[PDB]
Ligand binder design. Structure first.
Ligand SMILES: [Zn+2]
Ligand SMILES: [Zn+2]
Ligand SMILES: [Zn+2]
Lengths: 589, 256, 286
């Protein structure tokens, strides 16, 4: 893994808590701290700190996020600060994905269906190649990373490199191209495919966006050239270059042999298991499906459901962690988990749901227990296969704090100088009148406002009344779709409305600098979705404006809500003191 | 095309040649766009006006200037067991070049396929097909008599009731009996007895024996009945008007 | 009957004759009228093309590593494809040229030798068999082959149950009798998962089927009807109708003297009513 120095191009000048925070995290990792926590308040810029930490450590970094949504906005941004290193990406490559599912009650086979995305898989393979070709590699991963995979060993083995001048049989080159999952598309030119015309060979690699033309002097590598795939415009020329398999189910012919052997053995196992279970229909269905699958291994080596045989392909034992992007990473790989407070619970919940599915799949004759092995690593298995662990959240998780001992690294004072909002608490009564009054007060300057709710019925009834009072108000429900709130963003930046009325999903995917006031309905109830994390999230939301404000209307006051408000106000005083010590007012940025 | 590809054996072993696909034969025109299209497929080799250039860096072309576009396809001499690459570029040329290639003595041999005549010439008979010699059909009918045989015989009959090209030029090899070299009109003039005895014993080939055995059996049965009636002095070209009534009567007697 | 059922279920637009109404369509989805007509009038189509297993075998051959390295489609392996067809025959095997007076004679081609392929394609020997060999071995041999495969396995199992698998896989449709084509059609429909909601109407099929062929067809229809299929066949064979679980015998007298049910019910029921002569015959039998 040739690790090029993480060249950081950061015109921003670190200030505030950034230097101390980075230094203390650095010494934390130096101290062998396999468990660390960070308290990154809103607007504290965790991305830049993570980039600088990765620069300092010079290790291949895996960053963990809980939904594909988040990964997009960050990775592109880091590439700006790191335009001379391998920045990569990986999430579910599925525009749509119904799993292999089995309604046992109805004996219904909801077969695995998937609309496959392209660029996601492209970046997946680019990331795997970069990791197994260089140490200066950063990869953003959804939980999918811990699912079953092929071995980075074979990934690096099947890969083959060719250099200019060196004698190499062209036919052998085509053979290895086939063995590394590349098609002789003599008709057209497509991703991960190639064409042969005379001694000339032109290939688009699966991971590399561009293409390459190679001229052959008989059975010698005459020359290599970059290319635009279709137009063929030679980007440049380099003497040598490597090619990685287009599949992450990489496996030598010997590895296919071993996988087939173990597949047949565990097939006999599952055969006997379902025969004893009396699930003869499921046993026979699985038997014939895997018979076709093994037939087209012995013929082609490629099909659907290959993952279900990862324990056979990787060759490790049942119940052990299947291969992973973590294996694609070194042992001295850098690790970062953002929003681990939901990523770790997501890991366990995903394992539980997916093993419940592997029940009614394997337990009910669809695949072998090797399918169950082709799983997210059990939380413990992940915790072992990881390296040093750094959690990033202004709200550290309970188990996270247990792992880290409760200590953490603070970064809450933004260098800009923004301060937290002024909070107010009132009983549920006097809500409509005050809401309309503040609506008009903000409409004087045409400013934004937010509202939370608990029950769908009351939420939409209240929004309907507000509309009846001639209020520029909208609301949100459980399964609202992107168009509604995106046109809401258009409206608000065009100054059409002021207020919105959501319940739960509003908590995510909204950044509104123009809201100086938020309302929180019926926080009195002690609820999971309205926990201290919820109130802190609303606090961060209201902190956007220069003089934002929080207003929670509930008969009683929950412990979490008011402790969060108090800590918010004291750190707000701290931020104000820092601002005025700089002689700088809170600076919008 | 199979002979086109197999002709590499004909050209001596080791002799340099070029894999020349005549994609656009002699059709001049500024074809930089065509160069780009050939690159888009990907070959890197071309030859225009008989001079080689790379498709990567081809020469300039003008509509006025003649351009014999026979694109080079691959770099090969006469090698041993190079049929893989050979066919690879060769069927390719058989489509792009549309069936033609050349392996010149660049160190000559032309790998071309042509119908009718091997050299792309016209034929008196387009092939070895009996109807080609049927003047009752338009195949043998003269331009100026339409098979009648008259204009005074038409200038292109001259006694033979057949086209001069399809008289003997493509059919002079009838080795019937001895000294056999006959035109269609020559067999016509062969009397009943003459032609019958000529076909009684003749050596033209084993495949010809196989595919004309029925011919001989029919003719010999017909002639045996003809002798059973005692009718030989009539000739194969003898005017049908010579039928004396009894003549055609005996013909049908033999037939039945 | 056929007219109304087809236009109401299959969307036909033929004339329904003269009937006030028909009912029971609610219990059916789409009818099928089948007869002795040949499946194909040209050698182009062949058992493989009709059954649809052809492209399946083509992909099977594409599954060879040699097929991969050549990188060409299942259509390449086809025998009705421009590229793979030797010009000496258009990949038809023998070479054909003839005039009106007398018929031609089969002659193997240098490329073919009866292979009706090109050696370039035949170089692949998927599962130790060339494309010529695969198209060669007839239905039963193909059936005992392709065992772990699925769709081809269903096709060949259908044909084995038909029991007429002796037919060469590449046997020209024109070289197949009308009854053989009928068996092919019933086999093809036997592989369409109609749930039995469909109903098959049929001509008198004795022609083109020997006694044993009729017995095989009887087994076919038995499986169909056990799968839920309905059937109604015009037939002068006492055995066929006595095998059919119900009879509707129409016609008090030939020609205009008929035109109404004289009896029906189980073959025995219709037999007990001598209003039909076919009923009298089903009575003297059993
Ligand atoms: Zn000539
Ligand atoms: Zn004339
Ligand atoms: Zn042929």
């Amino acid at each position: 893994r040739a690790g090029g120095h993480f060249e950081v191009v950061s015109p921003h000048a670190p200030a505030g808590d950034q230097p101390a925070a980075i230094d203390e995290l650095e010494r934390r990792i130096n101290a062998g701290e396999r468990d660390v926590v960070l308290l990154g308040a809103t607007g504290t810029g965790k991305s830049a700190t993570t980039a600088w930490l990765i620069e300092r450590l010079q290790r291949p970094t895996l960053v963990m996020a809980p939904n594909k949504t988040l990964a997009a906005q960050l990775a592109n941004e880091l590439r700006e600060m790191l335009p001379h290193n391998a920045v990569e990406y990986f999430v579910s490559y599925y525009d749509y994905y119904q799993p292999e599912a089995y309604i046992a009650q109805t004996d219904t086979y909801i077969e695995k269906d998937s609309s496959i995305n392209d660029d996601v898989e492209r970046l997946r393979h680019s990331a795997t190649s970069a990791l197994l070709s260089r140490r200066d590699v950063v990869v953003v991963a959804s939980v999918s990373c811990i699912y079953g995979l092929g071995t980075p060993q074979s990934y690096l083995d099947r890969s083959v490199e060719l250099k200019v001048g060196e004698e190499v049989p062209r036919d052998g080159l085509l053979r290895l191209l086939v063995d590394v999952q590349y098609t002789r598309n003599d008709m057209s030119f497509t991703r991960g495919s190639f064409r042969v015309r005379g001694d000339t060979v032109e290939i688009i690699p699966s991971y590399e966006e561009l293409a390459v033309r190679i001229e052959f002097f008989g059975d010698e590598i005459e020359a290599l050239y970059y290319l635009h795939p279709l137009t063929g415009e030679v980007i440049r020329q380099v003497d040598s270059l490597r090619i990685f398999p287009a599949t992450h189910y990489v496996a030598g012919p010997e590895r296919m042999a071993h996988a087939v052997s173990a597949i047949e053995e565990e097939l006999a196992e599952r055969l006997a298991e379902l025969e004893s279970q009396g699930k003869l229909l499921e046993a026979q269905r699985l038997r014939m499906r895997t018979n076709y699958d093994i037939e087209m291994m012995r013929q082609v080596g490629f099909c659907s459901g290959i993952e279900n045989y990862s324990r056979h392909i990787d060759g490790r034992g049942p119940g052990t962690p299947p291969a992973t992007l973590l294996d694609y990473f070194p042992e001295d790989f850098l690790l970062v988990i953002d929003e681990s407070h939901v990523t770790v619970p997501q890991i366990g919940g995903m394992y539980e749901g997916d093993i419940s599915r592997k029940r009614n799949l394997v337990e009910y004759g669809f695949r072998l227990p090797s399918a169950c092995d082709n799983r997210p690593l059990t939380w413990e298995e992940f915790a072992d296969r990881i390296g040093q662990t750094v959690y990033l959240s202004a709200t550290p998780g309970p188990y996270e704090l247990s792992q880290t001992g409760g200590e953490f690294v603070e970064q809450v004072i933004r260098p800009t100088g923004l301060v937290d909002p002024k909070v107010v608490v009132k009983p549920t009564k006097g809500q409509i009148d005050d809401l309309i009054g503040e609506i008009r007060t903000r409409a004087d300057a045409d400013q934004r406002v937010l509202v939370t709710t608990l029950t769908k019925k009351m939420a939409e009834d209240l929004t309907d009344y507000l509309l009846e009072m001639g209020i520029r108000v909208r609301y949100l429900h459980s399964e609202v779709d992107t168009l509604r709130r995106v046109e809401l963003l258009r409206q608000l930046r065009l100054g059409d409305y002021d207020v919105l009325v959501g319940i739960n999903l509003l908590r995510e995917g909204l950044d509104l600098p123009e809201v100086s006031l938020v309302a929180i309905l019926d926080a009195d109830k002690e609820g999971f979705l309205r926990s201290s994390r919820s109130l802190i999230q609303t606090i961060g939301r209201a902190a956007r404006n220069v003089s934002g404000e929080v207003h929670m209307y509930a008969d009683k006051i929950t412990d979490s809500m008011r402790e969060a408000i108090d800590e918010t106000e004291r750190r707000r005083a701290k931020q104000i003191a820092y601002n005025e010590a700089n002689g700088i007012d809170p600076q919008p940025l | 095309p199979q002979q086109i590809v197999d002709q590499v054996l004909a050209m001596p072993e080791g002799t340099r040649f070029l894999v020349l696909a005549p994609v656009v034969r002699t059709r001049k025109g500024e074809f930089a766009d065509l160069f780009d299209k050939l690159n888009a497929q990907g070959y890197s080799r071309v030859r225009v006006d008989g001079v080689v250039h790379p498709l990567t860096d081809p020469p300039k072309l003008k509509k006025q200037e003649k351009h014999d576009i026979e694109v080079v396809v691959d770099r090969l001499t006469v090698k041993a067991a190079a049929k893989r690459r050979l066919t690879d570029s060769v069927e390719t040329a058989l489509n792009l070049a549309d069936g033609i290639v050349v392996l010149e003595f660049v160190d000559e041999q032309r790998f071309s396929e042509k119908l009718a005549c091997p050299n792309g010439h016209a034929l008196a008979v387009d092939d070895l097909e009996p109807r080609s010699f049927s003047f009752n059909s338009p195949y043998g009918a003269c331009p100026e008599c339409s098979g009648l045989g008259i204009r005074v015989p038409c200038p292109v009959c001259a006694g033979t009731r057949l086209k001069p090209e399809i008289l003997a030029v493509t059919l002079a090899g009838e080795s019937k009996g001895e000294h056999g070299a006959k035109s269609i009109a020559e067999v016509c003039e062969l009397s009943i007895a003459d032609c019958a005895d000529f076909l009684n014993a003749l050596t033209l080939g084993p495949r010809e024996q196989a595919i004309a055995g029925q011919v001989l059996k029919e003719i010999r049965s017909r002639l045996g009945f003809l002798l059973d009636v005692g009718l030989e002095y009539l000739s194969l070209s003898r005017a049908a008007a010579t039928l004396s009534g009894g003549e055609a009567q005996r013909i049908r007697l033999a037939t039945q | 009957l056929a007219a109304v059922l087809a236009n109401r279920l299959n969307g036909a637009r033929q004339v329904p004759g003269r009937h006030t109404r028909v009912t029971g369509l609610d219990y059916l989805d789409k009818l099928v009228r089948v007869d002795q007509s040949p499946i194909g009038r040209t050698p182009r189509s062949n058992p493989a093309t009709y059954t649809g297993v052809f492209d399946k075998i083509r992909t099977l051959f594409a599954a060879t590593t040699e097929a991969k390295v050549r990188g060409y489609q299942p259509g390449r392996f086809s025998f009705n494809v421009k590229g793979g067809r030797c010009e000496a025959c258009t990949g038809d095997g023998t070479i054909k040229i003839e005039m009106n007076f007398l018929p031609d004679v089969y002659v193997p081609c240098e490329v073919c030798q009866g292979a009706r392929y090109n050696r370039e394609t035949l170089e692949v020997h998927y599962k130790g068999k060339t494309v010529s060999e695969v198209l060669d071995m007839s239905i039963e041999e193909a059936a005992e082959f392709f065992e772990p495969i699925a769709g081809v396995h269903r096709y060949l199992r259908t044909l084995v149950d038909v029991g007429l698998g002796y037919v060469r896989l590449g046997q020209p449709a024109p070289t197949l009798s009308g009854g053989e084509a009928q068996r092919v059609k019933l086999a093809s429909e036997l592989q369409k998962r109609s749930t039995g909601r469909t109903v098959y109407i049929l001509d008198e099929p004795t022609t083109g089927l020997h006694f044993d062929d009729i017995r095989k067809l009887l087994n076919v229809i038995n499986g169909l009807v056990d799968k839920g299929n309905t059937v109604i066949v015009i037939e002068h064979n006492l055995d066929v109708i006595k095998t059919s679980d119900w009879i509707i015998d129409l016609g008090p007298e030939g020609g205009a003297g008929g035109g109404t049910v004289v009896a029906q019910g189980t073959p025995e029921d219709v037999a007990a009513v001598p209003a039909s002569y076919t009923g009298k015959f089903l009575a003297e039998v059993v």
